[model samples]
Target chain A: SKAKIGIVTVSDRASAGIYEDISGKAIIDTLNDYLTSEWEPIYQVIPDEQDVIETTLIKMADEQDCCLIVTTGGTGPAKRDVTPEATEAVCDRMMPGFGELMRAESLKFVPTAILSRQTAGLRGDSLIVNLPGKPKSIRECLDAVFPAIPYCIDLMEGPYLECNEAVIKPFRP
Target chain B: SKAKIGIVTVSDRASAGIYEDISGKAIIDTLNDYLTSEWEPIYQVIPDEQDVIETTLIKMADEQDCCLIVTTGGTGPAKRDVTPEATEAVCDRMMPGFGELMRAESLKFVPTAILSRQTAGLRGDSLIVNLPGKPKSIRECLDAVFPAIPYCIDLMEGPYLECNEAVIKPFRP
Candidate 1:
């Protein structure tokens, strides 16, 4: 069966089309590079609004049946940043490792990465992960945590995601 | 101020005094080996019940002002396991990285480590981490995740923990 992946970019500017959204694209591009599995993205560009984010997350996980949802932006310490809050509200369980590893990895590049409140969670069978807004950080974080995403999806009874080991290795043991 | 750390062992048999709670002792011993700062363990032995676990976590984190709470046992897929659930309920925010890193570290020793649902979360200024039952696994999980525990406490505006650099280095960069 083909895997349905969710890609969400949460930025007021991006959602309002005041600026082009590259963060969502970064997630798609990175996943494309890492996966050899049959998969298609269910993408969205939404404002940094908690209610909208929660609604979109529910739709993607419960309605769209996306095995994995990767969200970008609105994870900073800024006043409007609320991606992690929304992710928590809609998720049945919060997975903190994604945020911790991403921050730990990003701290390798920038100390401010600790200020990012990015997180991940489980909603039904879907796994929702939050990433940073910057395209470069998006790639780096995916590289750091994508190794576990496939196995995490499998544990959630999602599709078996086969990785292109030359690009990234999915740990399953 | 002397930091109070909660060491909870959540197992019916262990709580009932049928066997010595080595898992809780392992956590205390490991923390003793790691810390150069003054700290004391506020220990408890409780049954694997969600309400009891939740109540105890709140008491430690809120009333006792425990900077760190390390819980052992009932973090598996078993019917009675509910420590993670209780931790999540008592926490204002969930920290998934602890569980992720613990399982990742445990995988180096056994594949079945994925079955453990050990998790961590933030309750006000306190950081509560749930660990597995076995003394060896408790040691391994703490070793893997403790590097971030002090830093996490600092981020929460808790005590400044001084670690024995020769034993375990806490990452602060």
Candidate 2:
């Protein structure tokens, strides 16, 4: 069976077509470099709206059967940023270490990383992770948390996701 | 003004007077060693009831103005374990890194540490953290997460907590 993954970009400007959604493309790019198994992308780009983010997350996780849904943008402290809240609202259990590790990794590059509230959680069998808006931070954060993502999804009864060993070696015991 | 902290032990046998509540005391003892500033502990020994735990947490956080609330026990995978749920219910935002750091630290000591569901969250100005039942694990977990506890409380607008650097150094930057 072919596995599916969700790549969503939650941004007001990018969603409005004022600018391109590089964050979403960055996620697909990183995933392509990491995974060796066959998989398809169920992608979407929407505004920084909680209701839309929540609906998209549910659709991808419940209907699309995406083993993992990776979101970008709208994870800051601004009034419009609500991706974390939407992710928390739809998730069964929140996985905070992903955000913590991401923030910790980003902190090594910049101090403002703490201002980002990036987070991840589990929805049904799908693992939903929220990433920051920057393409650089996207790759940095994924590198820090992807080591445990496969094992986390395995525990959730999702399809075993094989990774390219030279790029990302997942931990499972 | 003297700072206040809450130390709660959630266990059926200990609450029923069947055995000693060493886990709760272990937290206090470790805090006493770690803190240099004046503070008082508003401690409780309670059963593993979600409603009761929620109420107690509210009272300590809202009424008593506790800067931090540390809970031990009732965080395992058993059906009766509900401390994490209660903490989640009463908390305004969950801080998952505390549990992740605790489990990661305890994993160094024992492999079964992954089964522990210990968590932490923010309630009003108080930071509630859950630890394992064992006295040894309690100390180890606290040592792992205590460096960030003071900064977390400060972010919540709680009282500034001074720690004894000889015991544990708190990272503020």
Candidate 3:
């Protein structure tokens, strides 16, 4: 069966139509560019509230049956920035290294990159990753860390993912 | 504030002391040996109960504050294998590729690899990955899939993880 993946964007501004969400689209596009496997997205854009994020994630995981879920935005330290917190309420576990790798990769570009609280975790069978809001940051972070995503999915007993080595080469044993 | 990491082994035989749990130890050792960032483990060994695994994962993420949680054992097609199911119950999202990649990598070694239901997902702020129940398999799976662990954690707002490149090079952007 084909893998079902979801891409969600968390931002009050984006949700309210104050700004367009380029980050989420960039994540989808980048993934499509590299992955050779057949996949579908349960794509959505939601507010920055923890409850909304939690509910939306649950719906996607259990109802929509998404195997992988990715989110972009609301990963900062600001008070309104609750993507990470909301993600916590809805998810059972978190993958800390996703944030570490994004920060480490971004550090090469800017010092404040450390301040971003990008994250990833699991909700049901879906693997949820919280990406930075900026489009360039999303690509940079995804590029730095995507190689392992394929292998991680295999450990989860889900769908198999094949990647293009030229676009995103994953190192597996 | 550093990140909190955890390693759990869910196996009826191993948890009951009917079998030695070399797999759990190997998992922790690999993380400690290769990771450069400061981290702490909230490790455990438990029976193969979906509810128990769900509750334990909840506690580890919300109470213990583990940023990354990895489990070994009970991830197969047998009647007793329920790690992936329990993981789904406790998680808000599932990262399917982790499992897919693991199976693909393990397929290089054995055909029975497909019978394994190893999986990964998110529980709140923590990332939980289900691994196989053998010491050699644990090391092989972790090493094959570790490059993405740090970045996945980073995306989830967990602690920073640095890797000893000699053992396994952490991915960089």
Candidate 4:
């Protein structure tokens, strides 16, 4: 069975077409690089409005039935950044490891990594992960936490996710 | 003024006198060993009850005016483990780095460390952290996240924590 993954880009500039939706496309491209299993992305580009972020997540998780939702942008310390807040509001259980690992990974390159509050959470059976904005950082952050994601999905009873071992090896026990 | 820290031990047996409150004591001892500047712990041994935990955190952060609140126990993958939930309820914003670093540090010693759901958050000026149950793990987890505590409090405009640099090298810029 094909996995229905959600791709949400929360950027006021991108939503207005002032900038290309590179972050959202980056997520899809990374997923393509990692997975050998069939997956379809339910993609959306919306403003950094918290209400819109919440509703988009809700619709993706509840209505569209996406097994995994990956979001980018609005994760910095700036007031306009509210992806983590919106993710927390819609999530039932927070996954701290994802954020921790991502920040740690980014800290290797940038000192302002602590100001990035990217996080992942479990909403019903769907797993929602908020990734950093930069395309390079998105892949770097995902590589740090992606190993545990398949096993997490296994526990949540979501669709089985198979990754290319040479490119991305997943963990399960 | 010396730093005021709150130590809470959340365990059914420890709270009921069935088992000694070693974890709570460990936190105090660790702080004592690390801090050269005088500080006292406003300690409490409570059961794994979410409401009581919430109220205790509220009192510590709001009324008691504690700069840091460290909690032990009720952070596992068990039903009664609700300290993280309570911490989230009373917090205005969360500090996910503490929990991430704590679990990552513990993962060095134990495989089951990933099962831990310990977290930290900012409740006004107070920084609340949830540690694991075991006394040894409490010290280990604290050591992992303690260096940044003073700086976090500093940013909140709480207190100037003077630590024994020979014992623990805290990061500051």
Best by DockQ: 4
Give the higher-DockQ candidate: 1 or 3: 1
Error of 4 at B169 (Å): 16
What TM-score does the A-chain of candidate 1 achieve?
0.96
Candidate 2 on B43-104: residue-level lDDT in tens?
89998899999999999998998988999989998999999999999986666556766786
* Colliding pairs, model 2: none
* Worst ten in a row by lDDT for model 4 chain A: A12-21
Query: Candidate 3 regions off by >4 Å?
Result: A15-18, B1-173
Question: Candidate 1, TM-score vs. the true structure?
Answer: 0.66
Expressed as tens digits, the lDDT of each residue in A1-173 for candidate 4 is 56899999988775465677888888988999899888899999999999999999999999998988999999998999999999999988777766777887789988888889898877887889999899999999888778777776666667899999998878665
Task: For candidate 3, write residues B24-126 as lDDT tens digits.
Answer: 8898888889977788888888999988888888899889899888998887544456788888888898888788678767756754454466778888768
lDDT of 4 by residue, B133-163 (tens): 7879888887788888888888889888989
Better of 2 and 4 by lDDT: 4
Please give the distance, in angstroms, between residue B149's alpha carbon in candidate 1 and its true position after superposition: 13
Rank by lDDT, descending? 4, 1, 2, 3
Candidates sorted on TM-score, descending: 1, 2, 4, 3
Q: After superposition, how far is residue B25 of candidate 3 from its true place, in Å?
A: 9.4
lDDT of 2 at B115: 98
Model 4 Cα displacement at B23 (Å)? 14
All candidates: TM-score? 0.66, 0.64, 0.57, 0.62
Best candidate per TM-score, number? Answer: 1
Give the winner by lDDT: 3 or 4.
Answer: 4
